[PDB]
Amino acid sequence: MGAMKNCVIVSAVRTAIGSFNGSLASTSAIDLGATVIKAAIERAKIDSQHVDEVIMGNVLQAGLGQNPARQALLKSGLAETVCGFTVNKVCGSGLKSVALAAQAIQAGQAQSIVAGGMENMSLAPYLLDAKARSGYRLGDGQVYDVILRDGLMCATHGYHMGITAENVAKEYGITREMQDELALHSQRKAAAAIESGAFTAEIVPVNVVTRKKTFVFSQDEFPKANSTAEALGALRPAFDKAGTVTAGNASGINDGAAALVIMEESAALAAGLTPLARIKSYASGGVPPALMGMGPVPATQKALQLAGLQLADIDLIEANEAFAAQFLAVGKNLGFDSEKVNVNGGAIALGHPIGASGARILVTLLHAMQARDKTLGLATLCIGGGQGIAMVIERL
Interface with a copy of itself, residue 213, by CB under 8 A: no
Q: How far is CA 74 from CA 58, 78, 80, 108, 124, in A?
A: 16, 5, 7, 25, 22
Site for a copy of itself in 75-94 (CB under 8 A): 79-90, 92-93
Question: Which of 22, 42, 48, 145 is close enough to bind a copy of itself by CB under 8 A?
Answer: 145
d(CA 59, CA 300): 23
d(CA 387, CA 384): 7
Interface with a copy of itself, residue 108, by CB under 8 A: yes
Coil vs helix vs strand at 30: helix
Q: What is the CA radius of gyration of the chain?
A: 20
Coil vs helix vs strand at 127: strand
d(CA 266, CA 338): 36
Interface with a copy of itself, residue 223, by CB under 8 A: no
- Choices 31-39, 103-111, 197-205, 326-334; region in contact with a copy of itself by CB under 8 A: 103-111
- Choices 105-113, 164-172, 186-194, 324-332; region in contact with a copy of itself by CB under 8 A: 105-113
Site for a copy of itself in 342-361 (CB under 8 A): none
Question: Which of 350, 385, 392, 394 is close enough to bind a copy of itself by CB under 8 A?
Answer: 385
Residue type, 121: M
- Choices 133-141, 222-230, 244-252, 317-325; region in contact with a copy of itself by CB under 8 A: 133-141
Q: Which of 7, 154, 185, 382 is catalytic?
A: 382
Q: At its nearest, how many Å lie between a copy of itself and the CB of residue 142?
A: 6
Nearer to a copy of itself, 289 or 345 (CB): 289
Q: How far is CA 394 from CA 40, 199, 314, 367, in A?
A: 19, 20, 9, 12
Q: State the number of binding residues for a copy of itself (CB under 8 A).
A: 90
Q: Which of 160, 185, 352, 367 is catalytic?
A: 352
Q: How far is CA 285 from CA 6, 102, 264, 298, 307, in A?
A: 23, 18, 26, 5, 15
Each residue 35-64 as x (binds a copy of itself by CB under 8 A) or -, in order, gives ------------------x-----x-xxxx
d(CA 15, CA 40): 11
- Choices 121-129, 201-209, 213-221, 235-243; region in contact with a copy of itself by CB under 8 A: 121-129
Q: At its nearest, how many Å lie between a copy of itself and the CB of residue 89?
A: 4
Beta-carbon contacts of 50 under 8 Å, excluding residues fewer than 6 positions away, are 111, 112, 271
Q: How far is CA 312 from the centre of its chain?
A: 24
**Burial letters 156-177, b for 16+ CB under 10 A, else e:** eeebbbbbbbbbbbeebebebe
Question: Which residue, among 285, 330, 283, has the nearest Cα to 307 in the 3D structure?
Answer: 283
d(CA 216, CA 201): 16
Question: Which residue, among 141, 138, 116, has the nearest Cα to 9 in the 3D structure?
Answer: 116
Determine whether 352 is an active site residue.
yes
Q: At its nearest, how many Å lie between a copy of itself and the CB of residue 151?
A: 7
Determine whether 83 is an active site residue.
no
Question: Which residue, among 145, 156, 381, has the nearest Cα to 251 in the 3D structure?
Answer: 381
Nearer to a copy of itself, 243 or 252 (CB): 252
Nearer to a copy of itself, 347 or 389 (CB): 389
- Find the distance separating the first CA and the last CA of the chain, reported in whole Å: 29
Q: At its nearest, how many Å lie between a copy of itself and the CB of residue 307?
A: 13
Question: Which of 151, 243, 296, 355 is close enough to bind a copy of itself by CB under 8 A?
Answer: 151
Nearer to a copy of itself, 128 or 231 (CB): 128
Q: Which of 7, 91, 154, 160 is catalytic?
A: 91
Interface with a copy of itself, residue 244, by CB under 8 A: no
Interface with a copy of itself, residue 215, by CB under 8 A: no
Site for a copy of itself in 261-300 (CB under 8 A): 284-289, 298
Question: Which of 45, 49, 50, 136 is close enough to bind a copy of itself by CB under 8 A?
Answer: 136
Interface with a copy of itself, residue 322, by CB under 8 A: no
* Cβ atoms within 10 Å of 226's Cβ, excluding its own: 7
Question: Which of 43, 70, 189, 360 is close enough to bind a copy of itself by CB under 8 A?
Answer: 70
Annotated active-site positions, please? 91, 352, 382
